[PDB]
């Protein structure tokens, strides 16, 4: 009631299109109130795993800041969006810290990102020299020279473009369908309490 604005969570969960995981979007949520019961009473989520906070208790807590990261990954890759997990996505695309406090929310989006029309080109990073630090973003598209000959900016024998499309256009299994993911990070620091429940 001190901050008289509604947290704009709509443009995160409800956007027409999400970002590719390698270029994951982050929106900073600050000085606003939110009725989180609309979130934890929704049945539209196939994944709602929280760490350090109780989901049904979000309205009882206030936070200094809230971060909302969103992206699209394969179904079988959603389990990598969790503290302590490893894999192609956790190592090279999006990585949560070991002391993560927040919630990982995911839902099947075959109806949105695999429509008969197309044009949504979701991609991921196949390889990186070192693993991503927690909450690090890498949007480099530099062709990697893995052999002896210089690449001169073109793909080749050992000249690998670092990104690859998911191939969501055809019909594939549930584990191979696109899933939209939102990661809410709740930060309780020494600053005044801004993002509260109601």
């Amino acid at each position: 009631h001190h901050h008289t604005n509604l947290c704009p969570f709509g443009e995160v969960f409800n956007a027409t299109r999400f970002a590719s995981v390698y270029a994951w979007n982050r929106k900073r949520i600050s000085n606003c109130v939110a009725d989180y019961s609309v979130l934890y009473n929704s049945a539209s989520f196939s994944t709602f795993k929280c760490y350090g906070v109780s989901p049904t208790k979000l309205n009882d807590l206030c936070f200094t800041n809230v971060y909302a990261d969103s992206f699209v990954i394969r179904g079988d890759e959603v389990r990598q969006i969790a503290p302590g997990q490893t894999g192609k996505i956790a190592d090279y695309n999006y990585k949560l810290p070991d002391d993560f406090t927040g919630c990982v929310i995911a839902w099947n989006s075959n109806n949105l990102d695999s429509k008969v029309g197309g044009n949504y080109n979701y991609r991921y990073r196949l390889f990186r020299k070192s693993n991503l630090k927690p909450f690090e973003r890498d949007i480099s598209t530099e062709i990697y020279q893995a052999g002896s000959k210089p690449c001169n900016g073109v793909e080749g024998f050992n000249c690998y473009f670092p990104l690859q499309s998911y191939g969501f256009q055809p019909t594939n299994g549930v584990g191979y369908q696109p899933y939209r993911v939102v990661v809410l990070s709740f930060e309780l620091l020494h600053a005044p309490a801004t993002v509260c429940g109601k």
Partner: antibody
Amino acid sequence: EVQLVQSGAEVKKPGSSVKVSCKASGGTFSSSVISWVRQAPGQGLEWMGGIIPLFGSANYAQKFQGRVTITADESTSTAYMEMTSLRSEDTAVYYCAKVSQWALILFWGQGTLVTVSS
Amino acid sequence: AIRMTQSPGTLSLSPGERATLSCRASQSVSSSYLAWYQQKPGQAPRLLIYGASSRATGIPDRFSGSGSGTDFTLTISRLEPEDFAVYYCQQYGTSPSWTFGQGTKVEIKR
């Protein structure tokens, strides 16, 4: 699950006032921007004003600042649009339209015909 | 105040043609909070597009929304007979402050 139900059509004589209601179901009421839209016969859509029930601070378009008051009742999830000093130019269909902070879609009522005639 | 002006006022096309409707904003408007409505005579407005480009339930894919900043566009790739109607755009947001365009009528050329 979310659904906006407005009260029935009304016939008001000039000079009187009318209070249209709009009952929301589904839990998104408090954390929503609930507006009132008006459409006079043969004309387009006109936004009159809105309110956030959590704050109770209504905002109004300039055209309606004088004679329109918008209230919200969280205990019953009902919004209201009261218009005083009705004139025949106020004969229109009145819609409540609502946006939840958790989505970008708009939720609409069915409309309320208000006829100003003696 | 923000003003949304639609162009053209009337659009006279034949079934099977492509309709391009414009919605101009007086300021920059967030593409997360721009909508399109279809209205047939005697009917309440039908939400077509929300969030600049998302199709509401049941809306066919021949309706597509786009644009950003101050120029938004509703494209009907192939006009069906049921598509001839009036289309409004709307600026909204998470504050009580919305505006509508004055509308565009898509009618049958003859």
